[PDB]
């Protein structure tokens, strides 16, 4: 039983992109603090299935959707591995 990784996303990076697709993010992640109470700040960690809402809010294909947060530096592409379930078939 490995623990599979949490996937990291970290707002401050996210703050330095451009609103056009950080913006829906940076308010997602804001609300889920604010909610939760916040001892976070600078990273917020979700869930692989929890990512799924946010290709929902985008309109966006999971795929495309993870390699997003990777392309813009907000989570690592180590993560990938956690995604795939299983290598090939």
């Known amino acids: 039983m490995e623990p599979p990784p949490k996937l990291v996303l970290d707002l401050e990076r ?10 829906p993010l940076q308010r997602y992640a804001a609300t889920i603090q604010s ?8 990273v917020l960690s979700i869930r692989q299935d929890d990512l ?5 809010i985008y309109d966006q294909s999971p795929s495309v959707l993870t390699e997003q947060l ?20």
């Open 52 to 56: 799924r809402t946010l290709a929902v």
């Open 35 to 42: 909610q939760r109470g916040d001892y976070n700040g600078k």
């Open 14 to 23: 996210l703050a330095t992109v451009p609103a056009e697709k950080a913006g």
């Open 70 to 89: 990777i392309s813009w530096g907000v989570l690592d592409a180590d993560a990938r591995r956690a995604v795939a379930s299983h290598d090939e078939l």
